[PDB]
Each structure stands twice: as structure tokens, then as C-alpha cells.
Design a protein around this nucleic acid. Structure first.
Length: 849
DNA sequence: CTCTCCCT
């Protein structure tokens, strides 16, 4: 036990904390509390009965609207204005199977439609079933929900299907994503929505009574949500015989889902794509004749292969395959040569280069842009070269989509983002490195890492398809087919890679109280060690009690669309009147930072963040400062130049501001805020007290703590509270700085790459962790009285301050408990405000003087 | 001294 700095408080401050605490203890209605005790008192089939009565609207049909919609669909098939496409929709493969699809849906609760790119299943199946129900005179009983993984998919498909009905968005076709919607009409309608939207609507309608048809699309990508959703359908569908489910999948281990749902009817629908030829490293090197210069294992893999292909390739190319450098992206000059090769031979078309991450996208960009070779010098002026990365601006502009200037060849250097999420349509050539970056979770070390790995067979399959979009393509794989046969079928499904605290809490609102029993039902069961690690986190932040049951605060956290830790941070910000900054922090950790990382500009983007951090040693208040400055630039009509000068995405900032408005609207409806405007003066009376903002941020990121011991840009000897040595991620404002007021930090995410890095952090003060943390005891270790937090960090503290802090933590726990059970805004002159004022007083002693 | 990427 090595004691830290002295946290004792002046006697004058302790007396007034005492005057204030015992004002608070002199104190003497609830719809939320009755909702909470009802949920805990009912068993599961009481739960089923109650939610059936409460969501009954589809029990009502509208015969006159049935017959009217049936009658202008009958006639409005008789123009030629919506026909040109009915004969154009008939040219899509899915339409040939209309009646079999219709008939299979009537005879089966669940069917599966499997099909490759271009088959038309997403756009055509919803209309096939909708137009059938209208024609049978069932229009008003038909409400179809179609889920998509990505937001932009939902809007684009909705807009395109509505074009296909000669309607504007909002009649028979709509979309719903989070924070934006164009809703269809209530009945005889199709809604495209993101999977999360549907999961959140499950909290009000846990048996899906408010739709007649559920279409789950792209289940083969095995996102958490569709895996959860199929898991829940096994619970829901027994109580919903009228409900129709259509699963939709690419041809990627499709049989997993057929098996998972008994064995249900499976339709296979042929795609529409032009042929794309696949070449491997042998083939590429036999064409380019490039020469390399400047464990094995690998040799165990390659030599059997080179003996089986001995007579199909020249010996000198098979010898290059014995170098480990020859496969993947380890030699960027090799990729550069094959780019130059495609520009010389081969017809007109764009090159799509798949590389795992930012670092070597940078290297190939610089080699094409500042060429080392005469061949490169040659081709420099005839290429328009686009890096494509989530942290880069290229996808936010339209150049990378349009066709190049005449005489110029387009070269796209991208991450995995161009496999599905972003799509360039004039690509005829894919150079596939076979390498990506992926996150994996070591359950035993509690270390998250980001490592470069080989892609899966499904990845290359989809990357191959990216070339066949306008015209027959070529896919160059920078690895041998021996490496291909050592690749996994599909990536490890993300629910085995994921923190489960949010999911487990959400399942309590669906009256699924055993996460063990339920998660074991998934197609891929998560490690039960991860399930109690999630349970244990929820117990610590007190969303569950020790027996495992939902607490009143846990019910609030499950109803907030954010991870429970930051939801807790968000509610504290209401109680403590700093709503705007803390919601700024939560939305950014919950989504992403507004800053780009444009090629070559890092030293300069590093310097913008340090100026936006306003020397506050917090990545989280850096984002809030960024948002304050962004609002000022709109209020100044300077928005474009502001974003330019500071390498900011105005589209990221706009979405952060709507999440902030949404957190503010939810907290208002839950009766925690007097106003729904997250900028409201009453909600922000402390938003400029920096020590108080460190306290609320720490309350949410607790227990992720780190301690620095070090003086010198500077190097850092720092370690997390589990003893592991960490460093600030070089993208953090805190990396390399010296002279912190405090050696203590909280962080949202630690990650291993070159080193174990803290990706975001706020400098915190010991009294703040002590008040809002746990594991707090007073004692004596040498002959020095101490106060500790988490039974880890011990601070010199005199008995009078120790005792008052311990009394203070007790009434805070009583206060939080009643705000959870009886939500009200803290009234500014009442008794609860006096214990708020006690805490601000103590925290304000750490102000930078 | 470094950054796979969806989503309520």
C-alpha cells in the first residue's frame, strides 16, 4: 500500500457540507414506480396476456379502405405509367417466384429466401406480399416491416421501392431509422427500418402485434441484432400464429438458418451480375513477373500446393510463392506494380484495391502519388487516386463515385468499407489483398485488441462481386489458393465478440430474466463467462441487485438507447445540472468522433484537437467544445469553413446533435428534466464547472481507471487499476502531454495494438472517484489516516473529511435510489438540491487556480 | 506516435 496525495478538506468546507447534508436529511406522485413493481410481480404468461390487450390495433380492419385500395390498384395497373416497371420488375429474378413465395408464406410461419446480389428480393418480396393482400381485399390488415443492417440501405431501398410504385415516400412505402423517418401510412404499407429500431420498438410491443409480416434481411452477416432477433422469434412465434416471418440471406452458409428454424421452406433466387474472373497470387505473378527485393508454417502450407500445381506454372513464379512477403499486403510496391499493370493492358475501368487499414492505404497512396519508379513516374498523371476509409472524407464527397476525367483511370484504395457499406459502380477490377483488421476479445486477459488477419471466404466472395456491376470484371487475389483453403467460411459472429451488458439489461424489459437460458438458444451461444461478466458489470453500476433482478435505475437504463454506463452518466447529468456537455460526451462515445484523419494531415489534426481540448485533458470535453464551436459557426454562417479548417464532418456533428436532442427528450419524458432542450439554462447551471464535469464523466466510465507516474512531447509510465501498463492512444488529446493537475484518468475503451492503449480519457480528481465510486473505506496503514476507492487507490485523508465523505456517499445513495423510483427534476430550492450543493462544494476544491 | 466498422 503506497499512499497518494492528501484529499482532506478545509474545516470551513466540511462544516457547510455538514450543514447542507443535514438539511437534506430533514425532508419528509408515482406512475413509474407502479410500472416497475408490476413488471416484477407478473410471470411470463401474464406478461403475454397483458401485452396482447395493450397492442390490439391490428385486430381492427377497415372494409371501406380494403375495397378502395383494392379498386384503384386494379385500375391503376391499367395505365402504362406504372407498368413500364411492372414489365421492368418482371425482368428481376425474384418476380418469377411470386406465386410460390405467396403460397409458401400462407402455408408457413417462417420461410427463407436465399439470393445473390441483384436478384431483387429486398425490393420485390415486400411488394409481392403487399400487392397480394390488397388484391384479396385484405389491405388494411397488412403491415410489413423489413429490417436492414445499415441506415443508408433503409433510406435508399425505401426511396427506390416507392419510385417503383409511382408514389412519394410516405404513402405505401416508408423507412424508419433512429432520429429520422419518413413513415408509411398506417395500413397496407411497407416500412424499411434498421434492426435496432425494431428491437427498441419491442419494448412496447414485445410480441410484435403491430405488424403482420416480419422480413429479416441480410441475416448471413450475422450481426448481433438479427441473431438476437431470430433468438427472440423462437420465444415470440409460439404466441403469434398469425405472424408471418420471411428470412432473407445471401448464399453464405444459408443452411444455418434453415436448420435453426426447424427446417423451413427455402427459396433460391439467382442473382444478376456480370461474370467476374478470380486470379490468385500464382496467376498474378505469372502475368506481372514482378520480383521481390530491397512462422513457417507458411512453408508447411505452400510446398504441398506448389507440387500439385508444378506443371501449371513456370518454376520461377512458384518459387516466389515460397516467400511469406509474397501474399497479403506486406509489399506495397508489389500491389503498386499490379496497379500499373492494369493501367497498361486491359479495357477501360476503375481499380478497387482492398487493404486492411489506414496505414498501408497511406503507403500505397504515397507510392502512386510520389512514385519511386520510372513506371510510376509514367502513370502518376493518368490516375485519379482515392483513399477510402471511415476516418477519411472521400465517402462524404461525390468525386469517388463519378467517372474519372477522360484519359484518367480511377484507383480506389479502400478498407473493408467498400465490400458492402460503400459501393462504387464503375469498378471493373478488384485487387484483393486478403487482409483486414478485426477486433477480438480475450476473455481471460480482459484485453481487447485490433489485429490484422486474413479475410474469410465470404469476404473474398463479396469482394469478387464488387467487380461485376457494370460489365465483366477481374478479381486479383494477392494470396494463393492454398491460403484460401485455410480461410474460415465466415467471420466470427459478432455476438461472440461483444460486451453483453446492454443486451442482458434489454432482455429484462422483455421479461426474459435468465440471460443464461436465453443466450444459449442463439444459433451461436456466447461464452457463459461473458454472460456473468456482463451481469457482474450491471450489478456494480446497480442496474441489477445482488439477486440479479432489475432495479428501478436498471429499468431507466434499459429504456435509454445507449450503453448502460453512459446512460447512467446521462441521468447524473440531469441530477447535477450539466446536461449539454455530458450528453455531448455520451453521444460521441456512443457513435464516433466528428474528426477526420486525412492523408498527411495528422500532425495538424493532432494540433486542432489540442486546441479544441482547451487544455482540459479530456477527450470527452474536447468533443463538447467542438460542438459548441460548431453551433457558433452555424450561428455565424461560417459552417463550411469551420469544418474545413478543423477537419470536421458536419454530417457527424449534425447526428451528434440529434442524439443529444434525443437523450434530452427521453430524459424529459421520464420526468428527470424540466425542459426537453438539452441547451436549456436550468438544465445547464453547472455545465461550465469543469471539476463537476469530470465527476459526472467519471461516474459513467467508472470503474475504468488509470494511474500515471512520470515526468519529461513526453513518454508515459501509466497503468490501469488492474496493474497492466497502458498508454494514451496517439489519437487521444492526452498522448505525449506533461504536467497534469491530476495523475488519475478514466477511459471508455482500452485496446491492444502496438501497445495497450487508452483510446479516450478524462483526467479525474481523487475526491470525485471517491464520491461516485465504490470500494470506499476509511482506515490507517502506516500511522496516516487514509481514504480509498475500489480498494485500489489509497489517499491520505484526515478523519474529519473521511467521516463526512462517507456520510455524504450514504445520502447520495439514498437520493439516487429515490430519483430512480420517483422521477422528478430536482427543484432548485428544495431539500435534494442541498445535497447536490454539498457535492459541488467538495468537488470545486479541485478547480484549477 | 496511431486510426476494421455497423447500429438504438
Amino acid at each position: 500500500i503506497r499512499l497518494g496525495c492528501n484529499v482532506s478538506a478545509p474545516s470551513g468546507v466540511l462544516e457547510r457540507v455538514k450543514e447542507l447534508m443535514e438539511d437534506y436529511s430533514r425532508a419528509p406522485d408515482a406512475k413509474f414506480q407502479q410500472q416497475f413493481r408490476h413488471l416484477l410481480s407478473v410471470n411470463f404468461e401474464e406478461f403475454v396476456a397483458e401485452t396482447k390487450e395493450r397492442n390490439a390495433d391490428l385486430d381492427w380492419v377497415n372494409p371501406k379502405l380494403d375495397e378502395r385500395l383494392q379498386l384503384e390498384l386494379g385500375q391503376r395497373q391499367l395505365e402504362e405509367n406504372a407498368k413500364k416497371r411492372l414489365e421492368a420488375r418482371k425482368k428481376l429474378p425474384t418476380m418469377k417466384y411470386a406465386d410460390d413465395i405467396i403460397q409458401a408464406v400462407r402455408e408457413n410461419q417462417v420461410i427463407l429466401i436465399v439470393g445473390s446480389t441483384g436478384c431483387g428480393k429486398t425490393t420485390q418480396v415486400p411488394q409481392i406480399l403487399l400487392d397480394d393482400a390488397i388484391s384479396r381485399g385484405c389491405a388494411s390488415s397488412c403491415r410489413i416491416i423489413c429490417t436492414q443492417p445499415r441506415r443508408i440501405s433503409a433510406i435508399a431501398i425505401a426511396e427506390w421501392v416507392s419510385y417503383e410504385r409511382c408514389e412519394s415516400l410516405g404513402n405505401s412505402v416508408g423507412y424508419q431509422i433512429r432520429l429520422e423517418s419518413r413513415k408509411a401510412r398506417e395500413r397496407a404499407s411497407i416500412t424499411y427500418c434498421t434492426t435496432g429500431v425494431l428491437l427498441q420498438q419491442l419494448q412496447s410491443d414485445p410480441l410484435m402485434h403491430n405488424l403482420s409480416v416480419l422480413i429479416l434481411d441480410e441475416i448471413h452477416e450475422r450481426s448481433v441484432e438479427t441473431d438476437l432477433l431470430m433468438g427472440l422469434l423462437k420465444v415470440i412465434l409460439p404466441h403469434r400464429p398469425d405472424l408471418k416471418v420471411i428470412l432473407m440471406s445471401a448464399t453464405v452458409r444459408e443452411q444455418d438458418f434453415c436448420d435453426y428454424f426447424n427446417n423451413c421452406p427455402m427459396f433460391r433466387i439467382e442473382g444478376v451480375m456480370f461474370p467476374v474472373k478470380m486470379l490468385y497470387l500464382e496467376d498474378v505473378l505469372s502475368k506481372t513477373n514482378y520480383e521481390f527485393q530491397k512462422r513457417m508454417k507458411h512453408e508447411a502450407m505452400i510446398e504441398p500446393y506448389l507440387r500439385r500445381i508444378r506443371n501449371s506454372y513456370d518454376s520461377r513464379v512458384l518459387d516466389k510463392l515460397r516467400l511469406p512477403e509474397s501474399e497479403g499486403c506486406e509489399d506495397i510496391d508489389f500491389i503498386a506494380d499490379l496497379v500499373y499493370y492494369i493501367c497498361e493492358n486491359e479495357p477501360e475501368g476503375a481499380i478497387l484495391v482492398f487493404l486492411p487499414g489506414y496505414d498501408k492505404i497511406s503507403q500505397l497512396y504515397n507510392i502512386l502519388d510520389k512514385p519511386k519508379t520510372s513506371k510510376g513516374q509514367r502513370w502518376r498523371d493518368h490516375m485519379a487516386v482515392f483513399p477510402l476509409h471511415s476516418l477519411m472524407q472521400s465517402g462524404e464527397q461525390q468525386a469517388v463515385f463519378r467517372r474519372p476525367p477522360a484519359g484518367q483511370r480511377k484507383v480506389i484504395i479502400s478498407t473493408i468499407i467498400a465490400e458492402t457499406s460503400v459501393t462504387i459502380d464503375d469498378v471493373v477490377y478488384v485487387i484483393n489483398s486478403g487482409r483486414t483488421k478485426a477486433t477480438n476479445y480475450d476473455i481471460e486477459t480482459n484485453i481487447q485488441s485490433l489485429d490484422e488477419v486474413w479475410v474469410t471466404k465470404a469476404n473474398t466472395q463479396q469482394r469478387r462481386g464488387r467487380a461485376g456491376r457494370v460489365r465483366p470484371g477481374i478479381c486479383y487475389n494477392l494470396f494463393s489458393r492454398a491460403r484460401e483453403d485455410r480461410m474460415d467460411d465466415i467471420p466470427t459472429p459478432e455476438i461472440l465478440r461483444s460486451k453483453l451488458e446492454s443486451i442482458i439489461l434489454s432482455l429484462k424489459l422483455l421479461h426474459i430474466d435468465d440471460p443464461y437460458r436465453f443466450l444459449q438458444t442463439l444459433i451461436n451461444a456466447p461464452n457463459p463467462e461473458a454472460i456473468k461478466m456482463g451481469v457482474e458489470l450491471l450489478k456494480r453500476i446497480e442496474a441489477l441487485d445482488q439477486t440479479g433482478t432489475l432495479t428501478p435505475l436498471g429499468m431507466h437504463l434499459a429504456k435509454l438507447p445507449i450503453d448502460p454506463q453512459m446512460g447512467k452518466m446521462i441521468l447524473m447529468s440531469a441530477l447535477f445540472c450539466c446536461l449539454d456537455p455530458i450528453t455531448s460526451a455520451a453521444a460521441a462515445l456512443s457513435f464516433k468522433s466528428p474528426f477526420y484523419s486525412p492523408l498527411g494531415k495528422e500532425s495538424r489534426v493532432d494540433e486542432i484537437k489540442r486546441r479544441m481540448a482547451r487544455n482540459m485533458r479530456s477527450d470527452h470535453l474536447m468533443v463538447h467544445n467542438t460542438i459548441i464551436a460548431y453551433r457558433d459557426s452555424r450561428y455565424s454562417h461560417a459552417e463550411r469553413d469551420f469544418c474545413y479548417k478543423n477537419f470536421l464532418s458536419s454530417m457527424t456533428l449534425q447526428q451528434l446533435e440529434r442524439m443529444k436532442n434525443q437523450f434530452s427528450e427521453l430524459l424529459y419524458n421520464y420526468k428527470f428534466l424540466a425542459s426537453s432542450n438539452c441547451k436549456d439554462a436550468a438544465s445547464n447551471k453547472n455545465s461550465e464547472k469543469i471539476p463537476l464535469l469530470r465527476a459526472i464523466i467519471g461516474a459513467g466510465l467508472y470503474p475504468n481507471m488509470a494511474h500515471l507516474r512520470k515526468s519529461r512531447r513526453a513518454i508515459h509510465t501509466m497503468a490501469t487499476d488492474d496493474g497492466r501498463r497502458v498508454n494514451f492512444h496517439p489519437s487521444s488529446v492526452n498522448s505525449g502531454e506533461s504536467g497534469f493537475d491530476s495523475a488519475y484518468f478514466v477511459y471508455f475503451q482500452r485496446q491492444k495494438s502496438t501497445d495497450l492503449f487508452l483510446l479516450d480519457s478524462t483526467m479525474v480528481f481523487p475526491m470525485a472517484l471517491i464520491i461516485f465510486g465504490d470500494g470506499v473505506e476509511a482506515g490507517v496503514t502506516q500511522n496516516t489516516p487514509y481514504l480509498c476507492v475500489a480498494k485500489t487507490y489509497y489517499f491520505k485523508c484526515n478523519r474529519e473529511t473521511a467521516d463526512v465523505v462517507i456520510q455524504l456517499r450514504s445520502n447520495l445513495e439514498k437520493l439516487l435510489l429515490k430519483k430512480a423510483l420517483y422521477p422528478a427534476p430536482i427543484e432548485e430550492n428544495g431539500y435534494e438540491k442541498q445535497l447536490i450543493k454539498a457535492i459541488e462544494l467538495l468537488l470545486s476544491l479541485d478547480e484549477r487556480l
